[PDB]
Amino acid sequence: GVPIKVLHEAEGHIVTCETNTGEVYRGKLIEAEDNMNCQMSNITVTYRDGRVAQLEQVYIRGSKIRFLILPDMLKNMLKS
Template identity: 65%
Template structure:
């Protein structure tokens, strides 16, 4: 069985060195520069602005976030032009998947993501 990484994990690795915002399942927000990340979404941030659930804001130097506690991450918009998407787009160009349930034509998620950015 091959262990290839999915698109979200690859994109997470591309965000290393950039400013990201992480919302935790508990409602807390961390915004800072991503120093390192792992395939399980564990990540290390530095120069963080932390916003508590009650709205209080504080500054932190370093923080390590457990991936299983992450609700979502906001990454820089510029990563839509990452080389990884160019490779995927060329591989899937022209491929269309048909939905069995509703008969609609569904583009592969990589291309759909790309189209949403352009529209």
């Protein structure tokens, strides 16, 4: 898929991820798989109550991701 290619393009960039449960994970995208499975590092997580935490290493299953925010560095795939 076209969006998937753009996701792989964001590998190595800082991205934000919201899960199906609304926890919000911000940090560096290390690896993005075809099914949207996401390996990240040096995370800041913001829970539904508002509290924050810090994690070194995470991996989130694609299905249980609601969405991702990518840099605007990418915006400039205009062919489609």
